[PDB]
Design a protein around this ligand. Structure first.
Ligand SMILES: [Mn+2]
Ligand SMILES: [Mn+2]
Lengths: 30, 295
């Protein structure tokens, strides 16, 4: 039987950064 | 006669291209994806019973290259087990590539890859918000209706190791027993009210105590006390849902009793949000992997 736990706050988030293309994301309804 | 690996190969082929390339599968290949995934959806429970370790993702909304980034960082199947919480189509530029890759991975790894239904996996909604227009432009109307028949068989919720309850929207005032979910027959549309509607449409709200009216004009809001009572009654530790854009890609509610996930960074070019994925290890220790454009 398992239980939900959380790590130390320093290890809660792992970041991945990528190059931003300003034309990659569009709302097709606009 | 479905050449699954060729399809997946062509879908992943466009990784790292600039400007972002479309992947135009054949009509028969896409219909094959819909038909085979539909069979698997129906053969598996509408209320999934899953086991950790796995990674859980929120909305994608046709941001295909962001989906590729998610797999790139979280590990392409079957390196990691995945559960997606819905809203794969609409708004973004590449709903077709998005849903096709997801359906392909479902067929390829049916025991390690799972897709829940979001409120946009519904004909009355995605006819309007982009998916139908994309289908009509790049294929035909008949293909859109094939997608709808497939979407109507998607599972609605998942429980991870009997402790994490997962769905797109949230809780329902009509949800007394999990059997009520299990009793829902497929194929089905999403009704404008009731249990199935709420599971795909409701939101948490910090200012409401019990149940309140939802600004969306559909379903309800629910407060922290509702979450607490739900978890205690069903012996759960956590609610994992999506359905709302959050700045850091994830966001806690009611002292970490609920988490909202949103996996589409810079949502439809109008927000500066990060996208997040929740990594759940074998012991159900949960952490977040965060997708963010560099600045
Ligand atoms: Mn959404
Ligand atoms: Mn939604």
């Amino acid at each position: 039987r398992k239980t939900v736990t959380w790590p130390e706050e320093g290890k809660l988030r792992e970041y991945f950064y990528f190059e931003l293309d300003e034309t990659e994301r569009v709302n097709v309804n606009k | 006669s479905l050449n699954l690996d060729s399809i997946i190969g062509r879908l992943l082929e466009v990784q790292g291209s600039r400007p972002g390339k479309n992947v135009q599968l054949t009509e028969n290949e896409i219909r094959g994806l819909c038909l085979k995934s539909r069979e698997i959806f129906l053969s598996q429970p509408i209320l999934l019973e899953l086991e950790a370790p796995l990674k859980i993702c929120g909305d994608i909304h046709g941001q295909y290259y962001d989906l590729l980034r998610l797999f790139e960082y979280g590990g392409f199947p079957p390196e990691s087990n995945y559960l997606f919480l819905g809203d794969y189509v609409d708004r973004g530029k590449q709903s077709l590539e998005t849903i096709c890759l997801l359906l392909a991975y479902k067929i390829k790894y049916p025991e390690n890859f799972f897709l829940l239904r979001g409120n946009h996996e519904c004909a009355s909604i995605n006819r309007i918000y982009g998916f139908y227009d994309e289908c009509k432009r790049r294929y035909n109307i008949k293909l859109w209706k094939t997608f709808t028949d497939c979407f109507n068989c998607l599972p609605i919720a998942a429980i991870v190791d009997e402790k994490i309850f997962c769905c797109h929207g949230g809780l329902s005032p009509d949800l007394q027993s999990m059997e009520q979910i299990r009793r829902i027959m497929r194929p089905t549309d999403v009704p404008d009210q009731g249990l199935l509607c709420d599971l795909l449409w409701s939101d948490p709200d910090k200012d409401v105590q019990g149940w309140g009216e939802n600004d969306r004009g559909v379903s309800f809001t629910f407060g922290a006390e509702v979450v607490a009572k739900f978890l205690h009654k069903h012996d759960l530790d956590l609610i994992c849902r999506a359905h709302q854009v959050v700045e850091d890609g994830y966001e806690f509610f009611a002292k970490r009793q609920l988490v909202t996930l949103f996996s589409a960074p810079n949502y439809c070019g109008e927000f500066d949000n990060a996208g997040a994925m929740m990594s759940v290890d074998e012991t159900l220790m949960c952490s977040f992997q965060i997708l963010k454009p560099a600045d």
